[PDB]
Q: What sequence folds into this?
């Protein structure tokens, strides 16, 4: 049951951490991609 | 069954994390490649 709780922790940890990882990545990336686009769009503008 | 749930977690974790990894990479890269192109295209423009 300890090994279990250990798994339970390792899992909880992995889960909240999963959650954390999943989130951070999604937030970081999606947003990042989209904003970088702006940057490009503007560099463009600027050229003209 | 615990080892199983442990695998189930390790797997769930690996899965959502997989998902996370797969996504972030794809988003980060595809987008990144394409935008960097813009940059080049413009540097070009600028030259002229």
A:
């Amino acid at each position: 049951l300890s090994l279990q709780i250990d798994a339970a922790k390792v899992e909880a940890q992995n889960q909240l951490n999963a959650a954390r990882i999943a989130e951070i990545f999604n937030n970081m990336d999606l947003s990042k991609q989209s904003e970088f686009r702006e940057f490009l769009k503007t560099v463009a503008s600027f050229q003209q």
